[PDB]
RNA sequence: GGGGAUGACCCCAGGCGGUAGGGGAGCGUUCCCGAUGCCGAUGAAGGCCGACCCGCGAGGCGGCUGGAGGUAAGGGAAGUG
RNA sequence: GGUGGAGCCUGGGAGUGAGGGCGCGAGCGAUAACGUCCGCGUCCGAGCGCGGGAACAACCGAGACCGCCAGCUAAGGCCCC
RNA sequence: ACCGUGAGGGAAAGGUGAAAAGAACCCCGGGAGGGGAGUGAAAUAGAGCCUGAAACCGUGGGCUUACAAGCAGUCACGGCCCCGCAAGGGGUUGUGGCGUGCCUAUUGAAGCAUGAGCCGGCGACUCACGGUCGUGGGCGAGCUUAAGCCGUUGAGGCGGAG
């Protein structure tokens, strides 16, 4: 009939403890606010999980701009001649490379420039 | 290297601590003079601790004068739960807090 | 020795440094195997051409290992008396870049 | 069929329809339960300790909040009610049915009457040499109207009788030997 | 739903935010079986730490601790989380 | 009837039995109130959690099983933050 | 033990070791208490002396710290430090993005409404007899009392008012 839940609850708590990396001086061992602190941490990072890809959307968006603009035309334009496209449509790694191989991009820029005018 | 340690000490963990924090990672002799003419309580207690430490030291752990303190720390422990006036109702205690005294003697 | 292709997604900028890859339970299985991924990023030894110019040839890599969801924990919470939880899923077989 | 008569080399007898049949587990277990079930005992947490003393549930207004439940070493909460009807009485027909199909299971070894006479546990040693085995390890002692004396105490003692032996007895994973009027138990069956 | 061998596999349909609340299914916890079950001084347990398993409640496992246990591959029981 | 997937009866197990917010049609009410009263749609329900309108449940778009370094659009925006 | 004048209330405190062999002597010291030596299987087993975890205070190190907001953080990237599951992770963070705690009861909740200062152990839908619907299963007529007898284990069987 004995229910010495012991060893047990201690266990879980250390559990959440491990959940507990190092964070703010205090939830650091706050055997409770610890727990909570977690709860939020978590939902949070979830939110982060989907967010991220966007932040990137932008990220590229810019390295991007550095380049498209560099040559002499905005994303309105790029995107357009670009879509005139046909056997080629690619946006992500684009910029990355404007960086990575000057020419590669260059070229790209050209063909596109023309895509347009 | 060898050391000095005493529990069931009846003193200010804290204040005690300033004492040591100061005779600190420094010369045996020198700090010795530090406990010697330094103010506040413990001073004594501490200097004692040192004495036992270095004695302990060249006697059976062994080069007298090249020794200094290699580290020093105090740790609070068993309490002295003091029962004072009831809230002119419910007692109110205050704990004298026994203090643990530890110091390292090591040659140069 | 660096080319940029794409696969059931981008995952790309590769050559020989086997770049872990999405699931593809249909051709994988095939242990050390060769497989064709269509180009669209011929950037090689300082000469690049259109991705469609490409859309014709490409390459192959060697199907190489089975990667089991590198751990990542999901704590499902909301003040809203809502708590549930699960760990990752994602996984992928590694293939080494075979350039042509 | 194969109802092997002890005294080895000696004759054969027949397995009756009764035991024959095909088997009823859900029930078997039931039997079992029936068994330990009416057998157990019972427990309790002090009525007195639990609702004895005088509790002064400190009014209110004062900075607190209230012989009752939830502080310590007392109360219980919903304890080993010494007050809890331990029995479990399955049901006659049910039960005997049980000893029944179960025993069938046992058939899956034939105590030749003469044996009701052997007068020494070392003699047991003997019949033993006669048919030892791990199933033997199982070993269940059955005589048929008033026990096979000595047989009754050995590294496996017990001695049910042609009337009064049951699944409890041995349906429980074991293997055994009942004397022929024990087959009279059969009769019971 | 279309076959399923026990898995499982495949297609699409087909959604899958959720409190009171209603239905399924699992997890560890100290007990009674040791359903032709027993490990351990070269460690029982509990402790102390961890970039293999589980969706998970948990597992395993390896390291150090500490002195004596107790597990149950399966069902039963409940002062259970 | 294009539909597809709710529809009906029998029975066990339920919760809440007092919400409010908006648009519209009445009351009342100084056509006064993030007032209330009924009504017709939705809304919101401690997650109808994302977008936005600054920030703002909650009003316009929107249904959130799970994939960080993909792509097309809502509403709403594109001198700068 | 103790508050109560009184009637009355009514704690908390078990474990070292195999057995003391419990710690001569030497060492600092007013001493306690600390160091040696001896037991020893260990004494970070040492006398309130098994297993003695958390809270919390200390002592050394890595990193990090003075134009800066926030619990939190977490997504990105960088610098420095360790690579007992090495070309990948470990810890820490400068910056930058986005970000209102947790629980009750609420039309509605950061909450400035409540709840709760920290950690560890206690702690709350059960039992019994009725009845009920579901079902697993034994016969369809099905079924059992009180008892009598049988009992390492101690074995169930027989009882036919109802």
Swiss-Prot record, chain B:
Pfam families: Ribosomal_L22 (PF00237). GO terms for biological process: translation. GO terms for molecular function: rRNA binding; structural constituent of ribosome. GO terms for cellular component: cytosolic large ribosomal subunit. InterPro entries: Ribosomal_uL22, Ribosomal_uL22_bac/chlpt-type, Ribosomal_uL22_bac/org-type, Ribosomal_uL22_CS, Ribosomal_uL22_sf. Keywords: Ribonucleoprotein, Ribosomal protein, RNA-binding, rRNA-binding. Part of the 50S ribosomal subunit. HAMAP family: Ribosomal_uL22_B (MF_01331_B). Belongs to the universal ribosomal protein uL22 family. This protein binds specifically to 23S rRNA; its binding is stimulated by other ribosomal proteins, e.g. L4, L17, and L20. It is important during the early stages of 50S assembly. It makes multiple contacts with different domains of the 23S rRNA in the assembled 50S subunit and ribosome. The globular domain of the protein is one of the proteins that surrounds the polypeptide exit tunnel on the outside of the subunit, while an extended beta-hairpin is found that penetrates into the center of the 70S ribosome. This extension seems to form part of the wall of the exit tunnel. Deleting residues 82 to 84 (the equivalent deletion in E.coli renders cells resistant to erythromycin) would probably cause the tip of the hairpin to penetrate into the tunnel. This is Large ribosomal subunit protein uL22. The gene is rplV.
């Amino acid at each position: 009939p004995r229910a010495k839940t012991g060893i047990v609850r201690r266990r879980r708590h250390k559990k959440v403890l491990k959940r507990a990396k190092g964070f703010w001086g205090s939830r650091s061992k706050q055997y409770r606010n610890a727990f909570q602190t977690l709860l939020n941490a978590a939902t949070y990072e979830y939110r982060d999980r989907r967010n991220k890809k966007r932040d990137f959307r932008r990220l590229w968006i810019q390295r991007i701009n550095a380049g498209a603009r560099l040559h002499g035309m905005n994303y309105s334009t790029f995107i357009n001649g670009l879509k005139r496209a046909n056997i080629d449509l690619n946006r992500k790694v684009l910029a990355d490379i404007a960086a990575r191989e000057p020419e590669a991009f260059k070229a790209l820029v050209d063909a596109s420039r023309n895509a347009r005018q | 290297e060898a050391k000095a340690i005493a529990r069931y000490v009846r003193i200010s963990p804290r204040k005690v601590r300033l004492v040591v924090d100061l005779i600190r990672g420094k010369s045996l002799e020198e700090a010795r003079n530090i406990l010697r003419y330094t103010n506040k309580r413990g001073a004594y207690f501490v200097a004692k601790v040192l004495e036992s430490a270095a004695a302990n030291a060249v006697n059976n752990h062994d080069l007298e004068d090249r020794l200094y303190v290699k580290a020093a720390y105090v740790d609070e422990g068993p309490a002295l739960k003091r029962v004072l006036p009831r809230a002119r109702g419910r007692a109110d205690i205050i704990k004298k807090r026994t203090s643990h005294i530890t110091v390292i003697l090591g040659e140069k | 020795m660096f080319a940029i292709i794409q696969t059931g997604g981008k995952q790309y900028r590769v050559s020989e440094g086997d770049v872990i890859r999405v699931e593809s339970l249909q051709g994988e299985a095939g242990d050390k195997v060769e497989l064709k991924a269509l180009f669209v990023g011929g950037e090689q030894t300082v000469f690049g051409e259109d991705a469609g110019k490409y859309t014709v040839q490409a390459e192959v890599v060697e199907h190489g290992r089975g990667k089991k969801i590198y751990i990542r924990k999901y704590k499902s919470g909301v003040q809203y008396r809502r708590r549930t939880g699960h760990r990752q899923n994602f996984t992928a077989i590694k293939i080494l870049g075979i350039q042509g | 069929m194969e109802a092997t008569i002890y005294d080895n080399t000696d004759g054969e007898v027949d397995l009756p329809d009764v035991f024959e049949t095909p088997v009823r587990s859900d029930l078997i277990g039931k039997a079992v339960r029936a068994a330990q079930a009416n057998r157990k005992q019972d427990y309790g947490s002090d009525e007195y300790a639990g609702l004895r003393t005088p509790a002064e549930s400190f009014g209110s207004g004062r900075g607190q909040a209230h012989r009752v439940p939830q502080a310590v070493k007392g109360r219980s909460a919903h304890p080993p009610k010494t007050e809890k009807d331990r029995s479990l009485d399955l049901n006659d027909k049910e039960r005997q049915l049980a000893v029944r199909s179960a025993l069938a299971a046992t058939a899956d070894v034939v105590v030749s009457d003469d044996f009701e006479d052997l007068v020494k546990t070392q003699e047991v040693v003997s019949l033993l040499e006669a048919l030892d085995v791990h199933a033997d390890i199982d070993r269940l002692f059955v005589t048929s109207d008033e026990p096979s004396t000595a047989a009754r105490n050995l590294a496996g003692a017990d001695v049910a009788t042609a009337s009064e032996v049951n699944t409890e007895d041995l349906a429980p994973g074991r293997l055994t030997v009942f004397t022929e009027s024990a087959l009279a138990e059969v009769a019971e069956r």
